[PDB]
Structure formats: C-alpha cells, structure tokens
Amino acid sequence: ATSTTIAKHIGNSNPLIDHHLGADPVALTYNGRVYIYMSSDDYEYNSNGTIKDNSFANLNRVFVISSADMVNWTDHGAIPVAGANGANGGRGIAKWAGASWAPSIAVKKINGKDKFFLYFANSGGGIGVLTADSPIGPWTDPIGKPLVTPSTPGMSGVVWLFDPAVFVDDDGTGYLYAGGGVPGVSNPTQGQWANPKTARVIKLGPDMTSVVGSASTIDAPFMFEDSGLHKYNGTYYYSYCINFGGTHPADKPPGEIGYMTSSSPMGPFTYRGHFLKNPGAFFGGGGNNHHAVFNFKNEWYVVYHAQTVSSALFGAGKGYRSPHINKLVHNADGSIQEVAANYAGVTQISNLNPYNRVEAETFAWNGRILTEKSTAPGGPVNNQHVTSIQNGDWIAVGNADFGAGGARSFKANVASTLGGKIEVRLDSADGKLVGTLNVPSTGGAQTWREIETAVSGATGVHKVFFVFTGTGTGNLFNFDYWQFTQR
Ligand SMILES: O[C@@H]1[C@@H](O)[C@H](O[C@@H]2CO[C@@H](O[C@@H]3CO[C@@H](O)[C@H](O)[C@H]3O)[C@H](O)[C@H]2O)OC[C@H]1O
Ligand SMILES: [Ca+2]
Ligand code: NA
Ligand code: NA
C-alpha cells in the first residue's frame, strides 16, 4: 500500500466519503440503514485544465450513499435527475428540469407498500418530485412539471424557491418546507436582512405528489436557505441557515444554523437559537451551510457539508463540498447544544458481517480509487464497482467481525484485461496478510469472474484492507463485490 487518504483518514468518520464530492446532504432512515442524498458537486475546469470555483454547473444529478454503521458507506451512484438542456446525455429523468439541487427524501406506506419520494430544486425556480419503490430507485417523474412554482398559492414573495425539506408526520401527513433568499436584490435594507419572509411551508396531499391549501410564511429571523424539519418529543423544529448580510444580533450569528419550535408543523414558530457554526469556523474559510437533523438507530445526528476534500486536494475549497455527520444533543428544556463538528465524527455503531455479499463500493476508507456504475451481471439496483485501481491503491472496511471460527476463503467478483492481485490484510494497509487473490485476465474490463482464494488467520473483529497490486498501467481491474466464507 502506497496511496494516501485525501481527507477521511483511517479511524475518522468525517467526511463520510472522499473518493468524490457531495453537497447539500439529507438523510432517510429506513429499515436499519441511513441513506444520504446529495447535490452532485463535481469540479468545473478552465480550458487549460485548472480548477475554477464551483458555479453549480454540474448539479444535475443526485448522489446516494448508505450505511448501517456510520463508518462503512455503500456508494449507490448517481440518480440522473435533470433531463433538460445538456443534462445526463439523454438519460435525465425530469425532462423539464435543468438542475437538481439540494434534495429531500421521504418514505410513506401507501396501500401497504413503502413508497419513496425524492424532491429537488430546479435551481432557484421551483421544486420537483420523483417517485420510486425503493430508496435507490429506479425513479419516475409522474408530473412532468414542477410540483411547486411561484404560482402555487402562498409562494409569491419567495426570492429563491428552492432547498426543499419534506417531512412525513406521525399521522402520515406530509409537509413541504421551502424557500429563502433576501428581498431587495443588490442592496437589502437592514429590515430585509432581518426578516426576509421568504421561508414557506405547505401541506402535501396524501399521495405526496401534490399540495393542499396554500403555503404559510415562516418568519425565520435572518432567513437565508436550507430549510429543515425534525420532530423531538412532540415539538416541531424548523431549522435553516441564517443569512450573511446586515448587522446581526449575538443570538442570530451569520451563516449558522438557526432553529425555531412549534407545537404544530405549520406554526406558529418561535426562534430558539442556533446549533451549527459555519463549516469555515471548524475547517477554515467559509461558504454555504446546509444540513438535516435525523434520528438513526436511536441517536440524534445532523448531516451537513464542508469543503474538506477539495481543500485537501487543492489548498482551497473553491466551493466544492463533502458530507459530514456529527451527533446532535437536545437538552432537558428542548433547546439544542452546539454541534461539535469535526473530523473524528461518529464512532462505528455496529460491526460488519464479512460472510454476506459485501459490495466492493462499500468501504470506510480508501486511497485512492473511484466508484462508477458497473457492467457486472446481477447485483443491486444501480450496482457500482471500484475502478481507477492502480498499483498500491487500497480500500478498507471498519470492524468486520470474522467471529471465533474465522474465515476459510475470500471471493471477489472482478474484471481485468491483464490481471493483478488483491491482498487481504487486517488492521492496517501493511497489516497481517490473511490471503492473496490472484486476479486473472478475464477477457476485459467488462467480463466478470468470481475468484476464490484461501484465507487463514482471520478471526475476531478487525478493520480489513484490500490492497491492490499489479505491474500494468492504467486500470488493473474493476472490483464489484466480495464475500468471505466461514471456517
Ligand atoms: O442563481 C441563483 C444562485 O446565484 C443562488 O446561489 C446562492 C448564492 O449565495 C450562496 O450563499 C453564499 C454562501 O457564502 C457566503 O459567504 C455568501 O455571502 C453567500 O451569498 C447560496 O448558498 C447560493 O444558493 O441560488 C439561487 C439561484 O437562483
Ligand atoms: Ca458492486
Ligand atoms: Na436540504
Ligand atoms: Na487510483
């Protein structure tokens, strides 16, 4: 092993991933996993091949990852949401939409079956929705038009009609929160900064793909963007990013996440405080702040973004963002403590079972590979593989539990032109070698073979490193899934 981690270092849980970017995260908790959906941050380039600042040009997909344990993330690839203009090579799902910013996700049981709803903003001009029968698709655009526009009753007055947050209440009623921006264009007055009156909530119809009644204004002090809703001990918490302009009081610091409470999902809301500083306060610089609060496996968390991967690569964040998660703490009086945003993140919640099929694109740390949609036969919805594998690259999972009896063999589904090796090591990239899988020539990068090799000395709980070697260039092999067998 020679390659180094970009930003998510071994033993740390933030950023969640560093093999690509992901902005504007939101969480779905479903059947023992947390799924994180993100804006598709992706580098823009000058004609000479140098990086330029993020202008959101590439925000036409939604990236999805998931975890059972907060450390190992399965990469589920990209949903080609936007279908207008150049978007997604003709494969875009929403043909009316040129962009898919800042997703929100909801699940609702309808007629005995769980149904999934992905909301997004078509830049600052409207909100769309896609539907699916699984959290990872495939996705349908049932309307063919935005769900919410400036003509939707109650939505006049919104400056940026974006950043949706959809919440399904305990009674099954969905609510859509959206909006932001500050009125007054290039020069808002102090009062316009203080009360933009651009946040909205509208009730959804039972089917989650329509609205009922009119939107209500939420008078979030110093509103900017990034609506969020969570419910704690019977109280509704509307959270949002506080704006950056005008003078601000000590209790409404610029660019931080503010929150308000109500006994009802549509208000009236009362400002309570703020609980997440700007990512720049923790990681350097500054930029936009986007978050979602959720409860997964009986703990409260917030997912947010920071420029921690781009900064590590370039020495400047340049507006390119990555997901992070940290614990969020409610006090006895219902107030929320400041979130201690950091790199350590959340300690692994549960071990990984290495005796099931585990996708190769399910990993905790890597140095340095890519993931992409796979040609491998079978596999899960939108199955990916690990690629851009060169000599000395590696991936690792956290806390695989081999059990007392341990492992007998290791299987890997691989495709390779010239061949190579996968070393299976415990604890560290140079740790105990328990097996070496010889990747043969399979006939090419799209011709797949499941290879089996011996394993010995793999018992108990360990980080597991898969270290890639070979003499060729460039791509040694593609790697789809693996599975150990029990001794
Ligand atoms: O076309 C519109 C976009 O331009 C608009 O982008 C917003 C631009 O401001 C961003 O917030 C900045 C974060 O960094 C701070 O230092 C700055 O003071 C902020 O202005 C915001 O996150 C973007 O959404 O979005 C709406 C589009 O219609
Ligand atoms: Ca796979
Ligand atoms: Na969001
Ligand atoms: Na590589």
Tokens of 347: 């300690």
Distinct helix (H) and strand (E) counts, the chain:
3, 32
Query: Using an 8 Å Cβ cutoff, are 262 and 287 in contact?
Result: no
DSSP label of 169: -
Residue 310 phi/psi, 5-degree rounding, is -55, -45
Resolution value, angstrom units: 1.5
Token output for 431:
């740790």
CATH of domain 6-350: 2.115.10.20
Nearest CA-CA partner of 241 in 177, 311, 150: 177
Grouping H, G, I as helix, E, B as strand and the rest as coil, residue 376 is: coil
Confirm or reject: Cβ of 124 under 6 Å from ligand 1: yes
**Domain 1-5+351-487 sits in CATH 3.40.225.10:** no
Measured distance CA(331)–CA(415) in Å, rounded: 52
Q: Are the beta carbons of 132 and 118 closer than 8 angstroms?
A: yes
Q: Which amino acid is at 439?
A: V
CA 344 / ligand 4 centre spacing (Å): 24
Among 141, 163, 225, 393, the active-site one is 225
Q: In ligand 1, which atom is closest to the CA atom of 245?
A: 18
For residue 88, give the 3-state DSSP assignment: helix
51 secondary structure, DSSP code: E
CB 448, CB 425: distance < 8 Å: no
Experimental method: X-ray
Long-range interactions of 210-214: CB distance < 8 A, separation 24+: 210/147, 211/147, 211/148, 211/152, 211/176, 213/153, 213/154, 214/153, 214/154
243 annotated among ligand-binding-site residues: no
What is the distance between the alpha carbons of residues 81 and 128, in angstroms, rounded to a whole number? 10
Measured in angstroms, how far is the CA atom of residue 305 from the centroid of ligand 3?
10
Could you tell me the strand order of the sheet in which 257-262 lies? 223-232, 235-242, 257-262, 270-276
Nearest to 60 by CA among 16, 4, 13, 102: 102
**In ligand 1, which atom is closest to the CA atom of 163?**
24
Residue-wise burial string across 92-113, b where 16 or more C-beta atoms lie within 10 A, e elsewhere: bbbebbbbbbbbbbbbbeeeee
Peptide bond preceding 268: is omega within 30 degrees of 0, i.e. cis?
Answer: yes
Active site residue 225: yes
Pocket lining: 288 vs ligand 1, CB cutoff 6 Å: yes
Which amino acid belongs to residue 113? Answer: K
Q: What is the 3-state secondary structure (H, E, C) of the chain?
A: CCCCCCCCCCCCCCCCCCCCCCEEEEEEEECCEEEEEEECCCCEECCCCCEECCCCCCCCCEEEEEECCCCCEEEEEEECCECCCCHHHHCCCECCCCCCEEEEEEEEEECCEEEEEEEEECCCECEEEEEECCCCCCCECCCCCCCECCCCCCCCCCCCECCCEEEECCCCCEEEEEECCCCCCCCCCHHHHHCCCCEEEEEECCCCCCEEEEEEEECCCCEEEEEEEEEECCEEEEEEEECCCCCCCCCCCCCCEEEEEECCCCCCCEEEEEEECCHHHHHCCCCCCCEEEEEECCEEEEEEEECHHHHHHHCCCCCCCEEEEEECCECCCCCECCCCCCCCCCCCCCCECCCCCEECCEECEEECCEEEECCCCCCCCCCEEEECCCCCCEEEEEEEECCCCCEEEEEEEEEECCCEEEEEEECCCCCCEEEEEEECCCCEEEEEEEEEEECCCCCCEEEEEEEEECCCCCCCCEEEEEEEEEC
Nearby residues of 287 by Cβ (< 8 Å), 6 or more positions away: 278, 279, 280, 307, 317, 319, 321
Q: Is 351 annotated as a binding residue?
A: no
CATH 2.60.120.260, the chain: domain bounds: 1-5+351-487
Identity (one letter) of the amino acid at 431?
Answer: G
Residue type present at position 268: P
Cα-based angle 351, 413, 457 (whole degrees, multiple of 5): 50
C-alpha to C-alpha distance for 97 and 107, rounded to whole angstroms: 23
CA of 171 to the centre of ligand 4 (A): 48
Distance CA 46, CA 247 (A): 36
Q: Which protein residue has the closest C-alpha to ligand 1 atom 6?
A: 124
Index of the ligand 1 atom closest to the CA of residue 255 = 15
Q: If 0-12 CB within 10 Å is exposed, 13-18 middle and 19+ buried, where does residue 233 land? A: exposed
Residue nearest to atom 5 of ligand 1 (CA): 124
Residue 315 burial by Cβ neighbours in a 10 Å radius (0-12, 13-18, 19+): exposed
Give Cβ neighbours of residue 98 (< 8 Å, ≥ 6 apart): 60, 82, 84, 85, 87, 122, 123
Determine the straight-line distance between the first and last CA of the chain, rounded to whole angstroms: 28
Residue 239's φ and ψ, nearest 5 degrees, are -115, 160
